[PDB]
Design a protein around this ligand. Sequence first.
Ligand SMILES: [SeH]Cc1ccccc1
Ligand SMILES: [Zn+2]
Length: 258
Amino acid sequence: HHWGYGKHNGPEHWHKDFPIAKGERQSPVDIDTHTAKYDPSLKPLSVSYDQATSLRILNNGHAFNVEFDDSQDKAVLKGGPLDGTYRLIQFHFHWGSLDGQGSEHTVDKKKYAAELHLVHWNTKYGDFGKAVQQPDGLAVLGIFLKVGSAKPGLQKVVDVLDSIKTKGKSADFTNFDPRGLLPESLDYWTYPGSLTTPPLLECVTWIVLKEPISVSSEQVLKFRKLNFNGEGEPEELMVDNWRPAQPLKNRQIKASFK
Ligand SMILES: [SeH]Cc1ccccc1
Ligand SMILES: [Zn+2]
């Protein structure tokens, strides 16, 4: 009876196995755009993905991860609110059953159709498993998806999903350039938070871009054909794999822009 996104095992149940679910810096949160303060001391983000080496795509039973070679400084996030260098390890998405829901963060209570998470770990802790034990261990770049025009740079991901339909399936996924998933502007909001899936560790500096990317209805419909279940098991479509907004508590959201 493992955690997931159902009635009997969804987000309102996670606290029984993971008591930090009710902690002081949980994610996601609603971003109240009028309350977020412009912090003129924040720096421009530095997103350096030109040497990124993608390896594999995995259906892990709760999302799909596009995994990168993180054995060297090849794809790194620095600047903005960050001290030091964070290495890209994977990206994944969270999405809905319908276009009106799917994002984890919200903006003035608005839900987007999906949300991309580019996960990076702080190289001063040496490995990802050590980094998640630290309050500044991870930096996650969050990007909202709205449905409209297709995102050309997403199509290579969309077209491999039929090969990883069910939990535990993986496929080779080399030479994928994550620069084709970025919006034009790197304006962002930032706050201290957590992983949005168990173990819900409070180790993340969140950097949430203001500008959403557009994807087509056909692109998101293919996300919604994935399965939470393993091969041969009753089909349960992989939809609504998002955690709702959590209490902000004693936190301030800072804006990079006026
Ligand atoms: Se919800 C972002 C995230 C997912 C898996 C591991 C680290 C961070
Ligand atoms: Zn995520």
